[PDB]
Design an enzyme around this catalytic site. Structure first.
Site, PDB file in Angstrom:
ATOM      1  N   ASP A 129       0.846  -1.188   0.000  1.00 37.85           N
ATOM      2  CA  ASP A 129       0.000   0.000   0.000  1.00 37.85           C
ATOM      3  C   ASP A 129       0.876   1.230   0.000  1.00 37.85           C
ATOM      4  OD1 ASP A 129      -1.898   1.860   0.282  1.00 37.85           O
ATOM      5  OD2 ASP A 129      -2.443   1.339   2.364  1.00 37.85           O
ATOM      6  N   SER A 146      -0.561  15.672 -11.880  1.00 38.37           N
ATOM      7  CA  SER A 146      -0.778  15.319 -13.290  1.00 38.37           C
ATOM      8  C   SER A 146      -0.997  16.602 -14.094  1.00 38.37           C
ATOM      9  CB  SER A 146      -1.967  14.369 -13.383  1.00 38.37           C
ATOM     10  OG  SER A 146      -2.373  14.147 -14.689  1.00 38.37           O
TER      11      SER A 146
END
Length: 330
Positions: free
Chosen positions: A35, A199
């Site tokens: 994770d 992004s």
């Protein structure tokens, strides 16, 4: 040193991935959920409340010659999905894919929430976010990666998740055979303890690319892609009959649909998520309503590049002094 382990989807939807981990002496192999959005290595154990164990493999520290109670240490964690676990701590030898750390904090669960009990395939979590998020008190503990780092050939790990197939976690090296083209690196903020990046934008299907900054985290422990409501609405508007369902808890679409791809920007590079990666199948067994793999991050407070996005890429988690992320097509 290096390590290389295969990671396997737990089910036909790629809801999560499990990676075998050796704990203790002699080795006890548990299948852990790696994770990159949390920082605790915790396991089902001989200490876990018996009624909260249903098929998991447990760690039994009393059977490990190298286990030592970390006296006084406790842990307690809550995840974004509302699941939780808590317990006490041992140190022990932990190996992943041939890479060994001695003195790793192994957080033994005394209690787990119902979602963990109900998932027989996941024997615990191995956190790969920054150690600033580790929940052990009163002495915070380091992740497996942070403890391995100084020994690694390069201070990196890579995630290469498969679509309905096994993939690979590598530590300490970048497998130049595992991706196509070049790797595009992008800046990381560690301020929230995550692999947080920005992004450069997105496209829906064959549509034009929208240049827009989307801050979010690279999180292998989250199944879906959670983005701003504007982006998600633009995606699902291209699917006839798609709608946001308050009853189901997100966007659903007709199971007869063919889904468009979704592209996200990494600097001037582009990662394309095929439409089929965005199909999470019927909302309930036999339903003709299917659950979407791209969902709104509204209310969650962060955008999450979860498995839907990361499995479309070869992803480098660069743990150098100044951390960065790298993305390549594959």
């Amino acid at each position: 040193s290096t390590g290389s382990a295969t990671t396997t989807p737990i089910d036909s939807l790629d809801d999560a991935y499990i990676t075998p981990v050796q704990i203790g002496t002699p080795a006890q192999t548990l299948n852990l959920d790696f994770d990159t959005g949390s920082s605790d290595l915790w396991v089902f154990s001989s200490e876990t409340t018996a009624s909260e164990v249903d098929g998991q493999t447990i760690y039994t520290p009393s059977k490990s010659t190298t286990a030592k109670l970390l006296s006084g240490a406790t842990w307690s964690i809550s995840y974004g999905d509302g699941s939780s676990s808590s317990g006490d701590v041992y140190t022990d030898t932990v190996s992943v894919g041939g890479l060994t750390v001695t003195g790793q904090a192994v957080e033994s669960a005394k209690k787990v929430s119902s979602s963990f009990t109900e998932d027989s395939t996941i024997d615990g979590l191995l956190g790969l976010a920054f150690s600033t998020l580790n929940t052990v008190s009163p002495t915070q503990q380091k992740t497996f990666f942070d403890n391995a780092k100084a020994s690694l050939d390069s201070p990196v790990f890579t995630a290469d998740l498969g679509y309905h197939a096994p993939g690979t976690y590598n530590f300490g090296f970048i497998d130049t055979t595992a991706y196509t083209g070049s790797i595009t690196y992008t800046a990381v903020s560690t301020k929230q303890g995550f692999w947080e990046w920005t992004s450069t934008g997105y496209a829906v299907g064959s549509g034009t690319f929208k240049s827009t900054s989307i801050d979010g985290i690279a999180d292998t422990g989250t199944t879906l892609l959670y983005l701003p409501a504007t982006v998600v609405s633009a995606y699902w508007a291209q699917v006839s009959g798609a709608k946001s369902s308050s009853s189901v808890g997100g966007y659903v679409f007709p199971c007869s649909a063919t889904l468009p791809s979704f592209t996200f920007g990494v600097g001037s590079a582009r990662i394309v998520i095929p439409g089929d990666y965005i199909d999470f199948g019927p909302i309930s067994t036999g339903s003709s309503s299917c659950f979407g793999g791209i969902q709104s991050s509204a209310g969650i407070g962060i955008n999450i590049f979860g498995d839907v996005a990361l499995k479309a890429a070869f992803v480098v988690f660069n743990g150098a002094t100044t951390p960065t992320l790298g993305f390549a097509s594959k």
